[PDB]
Amino acid sequence: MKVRASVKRICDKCKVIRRHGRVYVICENPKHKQRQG
Amino acid sequence: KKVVAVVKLQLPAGKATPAPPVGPALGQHGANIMEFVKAFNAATANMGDAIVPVEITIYADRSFTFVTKTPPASYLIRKAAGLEKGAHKPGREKVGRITWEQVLEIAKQKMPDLNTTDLEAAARMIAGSARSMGVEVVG
Amino acid sequence: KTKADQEKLSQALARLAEEDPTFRVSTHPETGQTIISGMGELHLEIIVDRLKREFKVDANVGKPQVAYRETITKPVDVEGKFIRQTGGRGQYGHVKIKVEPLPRGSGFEFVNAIVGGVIPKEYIPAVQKGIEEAMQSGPLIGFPVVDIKVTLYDGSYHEVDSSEMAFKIAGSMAIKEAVQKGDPVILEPIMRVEVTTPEEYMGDVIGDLNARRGQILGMEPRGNAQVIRAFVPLAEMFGYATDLRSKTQGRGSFVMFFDHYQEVPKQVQEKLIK
Amino acid sequence: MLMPRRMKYRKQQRGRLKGATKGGDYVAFGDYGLVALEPAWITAQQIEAARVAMVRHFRRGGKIFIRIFPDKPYTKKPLEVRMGKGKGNVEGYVAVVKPGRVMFEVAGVTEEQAMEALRIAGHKLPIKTKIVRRDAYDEAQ
Amino acid sequence: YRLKAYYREGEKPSALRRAGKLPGVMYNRHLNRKVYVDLVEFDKVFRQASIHHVIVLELPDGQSLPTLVRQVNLDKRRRRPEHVDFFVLSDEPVEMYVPLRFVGTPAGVRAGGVLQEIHRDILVKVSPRNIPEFIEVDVSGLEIGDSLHASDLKLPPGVELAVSPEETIAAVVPPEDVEKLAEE
RNA sequence: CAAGUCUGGGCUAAGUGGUAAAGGAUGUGGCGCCGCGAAGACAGCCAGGAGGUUGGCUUAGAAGCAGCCAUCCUUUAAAGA
């Protein structure tokens, strides 16, 4: 679930980061590793 | 020369064969896999059925030990109402029932296991298991 | 490949069977294709070199087919008429039957439901060999339409026109259509298999088996290991060897037996329509 | 789909969407509703696509009330054809929806479910919407 | 209940909304004064109170009349009560809407369906003295099928319905079940 | 490029400004209602965190933790079927 236009919380362990003006969302499962775009 | 144990099996009544999980855990016990079907079913030759929990503990020389508890609370309540199965959907469907004394008779059967030392408290632990399996209390 | 190689192969095993009696060659007793009995991937594999080189034979390597079966769900009753009355040897045959699906593994049952005898005695045998017959190519793929009970409960005749043959067709018609009408169902083969595996590997072993169109049936230990039993579709059961020895690094073994036939998941109904 | 049964006119003029709603701007039936914020033309399909997933989400749920009813013939000339030659033929239908209009509302369900099915419905819809409850909808005769 | 209200001179009834307060007007067969009340406290009260229970309004003139919201107009595009109608109750019996209390689980309640509150507010009448409340309606013996209506209800020591009777008060209807298709 | 790098208060931190949509976001300021508060609260440490009981039904097996329901009791300082 990397690049995309709608990044959301795929499980509470997920966290909404925003480093460098880019909204990222990280969790324990590399699957959830998102990032907007 | 296998090692030690606080084995917490869960073996029923009667069916005493070395077959697992009485094998892999009790092969490092040296367990008299036949001194149970006799020491057990002698005291449970009374009941006949219902599982009997058991904690077989081994030691150094290759000896064992094992303390058994009572049959599931859910059991004695299944017969004191002509049941076998609960009621599938507790609450709505009453399939049978137990009076205020029949409750106070079973709680005798398991009073030295729970924690309370009464019956007004014991009985309740029975009476709670009544809606756990869909069987009201005759009151 | 082309029927040419089909021969080089015949010699291929006629000498390769003696030069290695750890295998067996079998021609599917119903449908040409020949199986290569091995004992491990490699086994059959290296033969595919010798058998393809030192024999120059060059053929195809897919997997077996499955002995499917036709039947229906709903029971039906249709007419069996035949009649061709134009001017002489009339050909007059007609009957009505009662078709009814039976437990997968019921077989073949007919019914002489004819009262007094509206359908003359001499012809019944013929109306069965007709019905019996038809049941060969299914209404769906062309397979042994079975597990059914048939009820001849009516039908007439003509004194002069009728024919032993005329009836065989009429009956072969009522059959050839009751199946079409009572909603067909593609039955298939289920196997019994028992994998001996150290409950070490077991964990996935069961998995794997579940993800194989199969449903578990038990596991009563054996040796130091543990057995698992269950049913499975031969289709999603092929080359299970190199899959059991995968989940088990070697410590695994299984058997397999046929048992019954049974309906396909519909999604697999229209799959087979080719 | 859904649509008129009869009709005096097979074809009808466009017109243009203004504010307001004229009516149907309140509950009156269910417990929870969905309402339009932006005006538009919703096709039968759009409606159905939602109504569906509406019920789909809540297997065994209550009753949904379609408070909207297309009746406006959707025109469109044939493709690769110039102007003139009369009007166009019907393609489908649509119900002219304006802001403040209660599109559907459900009745008899947990808040959890209702507040969610509608969240989805709104995705099927081409316009943004609000999800209302029932407070001051009392008396709207 | 209470509610702080004030007199309006009658100047820019829209200046008031912007202003922050909600333009009103109360009356009755005798007197009608144009008024206005703050939202917050009218939300927070009408939010509950509504049109079932009176609201005693207090004006800077000591009076503290008892009234019912006989009407609440809206802002349609965004619903925002834009003007109320306080009926100054009296002593004379007048009609109002009393709430219905469906007191008894029907059969649809284990079977299924959903109770349909086809008319949770009815129009009766009674002197403001007797300010009834939940008019209990009897249910139980009802299962997804027909229903009951008319005036089959406990009419209090002075309440005296002003509807028909006959109006289908409420009925239970069949739930939706995902897997269901009829087309074919 | 002719006339305020004018004055007071406020927002914006992308060069947004310097042109676009649904839909995403602990952006960032601002108004609000409504809770816990020193017989010790938020983050916080070490602690305990249990027994009836693997609840009942179902299943291959369901033991707090597929999924139906159901949610009583208990010994307590406290522990959810």
From Swiss-Prot, chain B:
Gene Ontology CC entries for this record: cytosolic large ribosomal subunit
Modification after translation, per record: The protein probably contains twelve methyl groups; at least one lysine residue (Lys-2) is known to be trimethylated. Methylation of the protein is not required for function.
Domain of life the protein comes from: Bacteria
Molecular-function annotations in GO: large ribosomal subunit rRNA binding; structural constituent of ribosome
Keyword annotations from UniProtKB, A to Z: Methylation, Ribonucleoprotein, Ribosomal protein, RNA-binding, rRNA-binding
Modified residue annotations for N6,N6,N6-trimethyllysine: 2, 38, 69
One Pfam family matching this protein: Ribosomal_L11
Any Gene Ontology biological process: translation
InterPro entries (UniProt xref): Ribosomal_uL11 (IPR000911), Ribosomal_uL11_bac-typ (IPR006519), Ribosomal_uL11_C (IPR020783), Ribosomal_uL11_C_sf (IPR036769), Ribosomal_uL11_CS (IPR020785), Ribosomal_uL11_N (IPR020784), Ribosomal_uL11_N_sf (IPR036796)
Keyword Protease part of the UniProt annotation: no
Similarity comment: family membership: Belongs to the universal ribosomal protein uL11 family.
Biological role: Forms part of the ribosomal stalk which helps the ribosome interact with GTP-bound translation factors. The stalk extends beyond the surface of the 70S ribosome and is preferentially stabilized in 70S versus 50S crystals.
Oligomer status and interactors: Part of the ribosomal stalk of the 50S ribosomal subunit. Interacts with L10 and the large rRNA to form the base of the stalk. L10 forms an elongated spine to which 3 L12 dimers bind in a sequential fashion forming a heptameric L10(L12)2(L12)2(L12)2 complex. Contacts one of the L7 dimers. Interacts with RF2 (release factor 2).
UniProtKB/Swiss-Prot annotation, chain C:
Subcellular location, record wording: Cytoplasm
Coiled-coil annotated residue ranges, if any: none
Protein's job: Catalyzes the GTP-dependent ribosomal translocation step during translation elongation. During this step, the ribosome changes from the pre-translocational (PRE) to the post-translocational (POST) state as the newly formed A-site-bound peptidyl-tRNA and P-site-bound deacylated tRNA move to the P and E sites, respectively. Catalyzes the coordinated movement of the two tRNA molecules, the mRNA and conformational changes in the ribosome.
Family recorded in the similarity comment: Belongs to the TRAFAC class translation factor GTPase superfamily. Classic translation factor GTPase family. EF-G/EF-2 subfamily.
Protein name per UniProt: Elongation factor G
Organism phylogeny: Bacteria, Thermotogati, Deinococcota, Deinococci, Thermales
Residues of the full protein shown: 416 to 689 of 691
From Swiss-Prot, chain D:
UniProt keyword ATP-binding present: no
Record Gene3D superfamilies: Ribosomal protein L10e/L16
GO cellular component: cytosolic large ribosomal subunit
InterPro entries linked: Ribosomal_uL16, Ribosomal_uL16_bact-type, Ribosomal_uL16_dom, Ribosomal_uL16_sf
GO BP terms in the entry: translation
Molecular function via GO: rRNA binding; structural constituent of ribosome; tRNA binding
Entry keywords, A to Z: Ribonucleoprotein, Ribosomal protein, RNA-binding, rRNA-binding, tRNA-binding
SUPFAM superfamilies (alphabetical): Ribosomal protein L16p/L10e (SSF54686)
Subunit text: Part of the 50S ribosomal subunit.
Membership in a protein family: Belongs to the universal ribosomal protein uL16 family.
Job of this protein: This protein binds directly to 23S rRNA. Interacts with the A site tRNA.
Name used for this protein in its record: Large ribosomal subunit protein uL16
Source species taxonomy: Bacteria, Thermotogati, Deinococcota, Deinococci, Thermales
UniProtKB/Swiss-Prot annotation, chain E:
GO molecular function: 5S rRNA binding; structural constituent of ribosome
GO biological process: translation
Oligomer status and interactors: Part of the 50S ribosomal subunit. Contacts the 5S rRNA; has been isolated in a complex with 5S rRNA and uL5, 5S rRNA and DNA binding protein II; 5S rRNA and uL18; 5S rRNA, uL5 and DNA binding protein II.
RNA-binding recorded as keyword: yes
InterPro entries the UniProt entry points to: Rbsml_bL25/Gln-tRNA_synth_N (IPR020056), Ribosomal_bL25/Gln-tRNA_synth (IPR011035), Ribosomal_bL25_b-dom (IPR020057), Ribosomal_bL25_C (IPR037121), Ribosomal_bL25_long (IPR001021), Ribosomal_L25_dom (IPR029751), Ribosomal_uL5_bac-type (IPR020930)
The species this protein was found in: Thermus thermophilus (strain ATCC 27634 / DSM 579 / HB8)
Function per UniProt: This is one of 3 proteins that mediate the attachment of the 5S rRNA onto the large ribosomal subunit.
CDD domains with a match to the protein in the record: Ribosomal_L25_TL5_CTC (cd00495)
Keywords: Ribonucleoprotein, Ribosomal protein, RNA-binding, rRNA-binding
Name of the protein described by the UniProt record: Large ribosomal subunit protein bL25
Family per record: Belongs to the bacterial ribosomal protein bL25 family. CTC subfamily.
GO annotations of cellular component type: cytosolic large ribosomal subunit
